[PDB]
From Swiss-Prot, chains A, B:
Name of encoding gene: roxA
GO biological process assignments: post-translational protein modification
Pfam families: JmjC_2, ROXA-like_wH
Record protein name field: Ribosomal protein uL16 3-hydroxylase
Family label: Belongs to the ROX family. RoxA/YcfD subfamily.
Record function comment: Growth-regulating oxygenase that catalyzes the hydroxylation of ribosomal protein uL16 on 'Arg-81'.
Disruption of the gene: reported phenotype: Cells lacking this gene grow similarly as wild-type under standard conditions, but show reduced growth under low nutrient conditions; this result correlates with a bulk protein translation rate that is lower by a factor of three or four in the deletion mutant strain than that in the wild-type. Deletion of this gene also leads to loss of uL16 (Rpl16) hydroxylation.
C-alpha cells in the first residue's frame, strides 16, 4: 500500500515552498489511514516512544508525558494524543513520506501523528520548520495567519476532510482543533541553524585533532600601546578560522556524518547471531529483500554515503546510489558489487548494526 | 628594581623573531637574580603552584609533581626543579617581563623558572611557542638544532653566563643542562591554534544563543537522486557559517574575552570588606598606588578593555589605556575619569574581584 500525491510540484515549489501556506484539497484520493487510533495508543504505552497528552479545561492547559500505563478516564472532548517519529515504529505510517521525496531527503524529518476528540488540539503554535499536515479520518478546523503565541487573524481558515493536506512554511502561526474524532499526520522538515553547524563542526575538529596550526607572526606589527590587539592580527586569526572551515574534504565528511543522524530514537535491534558476508550474499541471490530501518537517514555527499552518522566508502557508485535511494533492496540493485567481498562485508556490518534487515 | 635589555629590537624582529634562534650575549648587564633557589623551593611547597622535579639516573628519567613536602635526600647532581608562572606568585620575578613588551602583551605568556644542579635538565625538547631563556646565576650548556624528541645536530652550542639570553622560535629542538648550580628564567609566549579559536568561538555562540538563523531554500534545487546533498546547498551552509564568524562585534567580544584569560591559576584574594567607590577615589587622591595582580592579562580590543575574560566598558579612553598598559597606577593616570561614579564603581568591582589592589 503506497500513496500517490496529486499535487502539481513545479507550481508548489514556485509559489508555496518556504513562501506561503496552502490547503491541498484532495492531495490524497480515497485516503486510507495507515494506522488506527487504537494502534497509536498502543505505541504510546512503550518506553522508547515520544508521546504527550494535551488537554484543556476552562482556559488552562495540561501536558502529560508518556509512556502511558492508562487511558481509563480521559473525557469525551478537549484532549489530544501526540506521538513523534511514528515512522520509526510503524512501517505503513512510514509509507506516507515516500511521495514527499520531491523535496530532498536531507531536509525531511519524521512523521508525527495526533489523535484528537472534538475540541482537542495543542493550541496556537509557531514553528521554524516546514510541515505538511495530512488529514486522516475525521474533520479538523485549521487556521493560519500572516508571518508576524498570542492570538492571530487568519488568512486561511478551513475544515480539513480525509485526503486534504495543509502546508505551512516556517514562521506562520497556526492552530488546529478537531470537530469529529480526527487523525492528523504531520510530515515535518528540518533545517540546521548556524549555531548547530558551528558547534558540530567545532566538535568534529576537536575529536579528530584538526586545525593544529598556530598563529605565526614573523612580521609582528608595531603598536603605540603594548596591550593593543591590532585589526590585522584579528583578521589573520579570522582568516585561519575561515580557511579551516573551507578545507575541501573535512567539511564534506563532518556534515555528512552530522546531517545523517536522527533527532529521535531509532528501533535498533542487531541480529543474533551476526551475519557473515556469505549469508548476506546468499540471502540476496535467493531473492530476499533488504529493508532499511524506519527513520534511518541515508544521504549521498560527493562520493561517500552516510548512514546514521557513519561513513560508507565504496567504489561501486550504482550500488551506493541504490542503498541511498531505495528503502527496499534486491540483488539487481547492487549488481556486480555483491561479487566484491569488501562491499559485502560492509553490507554485513550495516545489517549487524541493525540498519538494514531482511524482509522483516 | 627594573631590568634594561640591551638588545637591538629592529634587528631582532627583522632577523630572528619567529625565524631563527640566537644567543643575546649580555642581554642584561650585571644581572641580579630576582629570586633565590631557596625562595623558589619555598614556592614549590605550595598547593596552588605548578612545579615538577626532573631527575635522570643511568639513562632513564623521573618526573615528580609538586607540591613537595620534602627535599631531604635529592642528590648533588642530575636533577632540576621547575616552577610555572612564578610571576603569578613573585613580584620581583614579574619585573623580568617588562623589557619584553616590545612584543605585544596578547602574545606573551608567563615566567617559568628552573633551578638545576650540575647535569640537571629536562632533556631534548621541541615546542610550538617562542621563548627567551634568561641565564641567572651559574652556567648552562644550551644546544639548539635546525627546525626539523630524537637527538639532533646543533647549530647553536653555547655556555650561558649570567645576563645571557637564548631566544628560540617554535619548532627548533633544544636541550640545556647545568654546569654549575644554575637559575634559568624562561619568558614564554603563546599563540592560539585554529582548533582553540573555533572551539572557543563555538562555545561563545552557544552560550549567548547566537546564530539562530536557519537554512532556508525557497529555490530548492532539483536533483537526480532524492538522497543527494548538492554542492550549492553545502556552499550556502558554509557561507552562513563564515558570515556568522565575520560578524563585526561578536568576534571582537569573544576574542577579547578569550585571549585575556591566563593558562595558570592566579593569586585571587578579594579584599574584605569590599571597597566602596568612595574608598577607591580617596585612596587614589591621597596618592596611593593601584597595582595589577601578577599574571593578570589586560588587553585592548577596539574600544573595550578585557581583564581576565571580563569586559570593561567606559567612554574614558585615556584611563582605560592607562589600565591596560600600566601595571602600577596613580590618580594622574586616570585623570578626570575618577569624577565619574560609573567608572569609579567599575574600578571598585575590579578591585573587589582581586584584580587590582592598593600598594600590596
Amino acid at each position: 500500500m503506497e500513496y500517490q500525491l496529486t499535487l502539481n510540484w513545479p507550481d508548489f515549489l514556485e509559489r508555496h515552498w518556504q513562501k506561503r501556506p496552502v490547503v491541498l484539497k484532495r492531495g490524497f484520493n480515497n485516503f486510507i489511514d495507515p494506522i488506527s487510533p487504537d494502534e497509536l495508543a498502543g505505541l504510546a504505552m512503550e518506553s522508547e516512544v515520544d508521546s504527550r497528552l494535551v488537554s484543556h479545561q476552562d482556559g488552562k492547559w495540561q501536558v502529560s508525558h508518556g509512556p502511558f500505563e492508562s487511558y481509563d478516564h480521559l473525557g469525551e472532548t478537549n484532549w489530544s494524543l501526540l506521538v513523534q517519529a511514528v515512522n520509526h515504529w510503524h512501517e505503513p505510517t512510514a509509507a506516507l513520506m515516500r511521495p514527499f521525496r520531491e523535496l530532498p531527503d536531507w531536509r525531511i524529518d519524521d512523521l508525527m501523528i495526533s489523535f484528537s476528540v472534538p475540541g482537542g488540539g495543542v493550541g496556537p503554535h509557531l514553528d521554524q520548520y516546514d510541515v505538511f499536515i495530512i488529514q486522516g479520518t475525521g474533520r479538523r478546523r485549521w487556521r493560519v495567519g500572516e508571518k508576524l503565541v498570542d492570538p492571530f487573524e487568519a488568512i486561511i481558515d478551513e475544515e480539513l476532510e480525509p485526503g486534504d493536506i495543509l502546508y505551512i512554511p516556517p514562521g506562520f502561526p497556526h492552530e488546529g482543533y478537531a470537530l469529529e474524532n480526527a487523525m492528523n499526520y504531520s510530515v515535518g522538515f528540518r533545517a540546521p541553524n548556524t549555531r548547530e553547524l558551528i558547534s558540530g563542526f567545532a566538535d568534529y575538529v576537536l575529536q579528530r585533532e584538526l586545525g593544529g596550526n598556530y598563529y605565526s607572526d614573523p612580521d609582528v606589527p608595531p603598536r603605540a600601546h603594548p596591550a593593543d590587539v591590532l585589526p590585522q592580527e584579528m583578521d589573520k586569526l579570522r582568516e585561519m578560522m575561515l580557511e579551516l572551515i573551507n578545507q575541501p574534504e573535512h567539511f564534506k565528511q563532518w556534515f555528512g556524518e552530522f546531517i545523517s543522524q536522527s533527532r529521535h530514537e531509532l528501533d535498533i535491534a542487531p541480529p543474533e547471531p551476526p551475519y557473515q558476508p556469505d549469508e548476506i550474499y546468499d540471502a540476496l541471490k535467493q531473492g530476499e529483500v533488504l529493508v532499511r530501518l524506519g527513520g534511518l537517514r541515508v544521504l549521498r555527499i560527493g562520493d561517500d554515503v552516510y548512514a546514521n552518522g557513519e561513513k560508507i566508502d565504496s567504489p561501486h557508485r550504482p550500488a551506493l546510489d541504490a542503498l541511498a535511494s531505495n528503502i527496499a533492496l534486491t540483488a539487481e540493485n547492487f549488481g556486480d558489487a555483491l561479487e566484491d567481498p569488501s562491499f559485502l562485508a560492509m553490507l554485513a556490518a550495516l545489517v549487524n548494526s541493525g540498519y538494514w534487515f531482511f524482509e522483516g
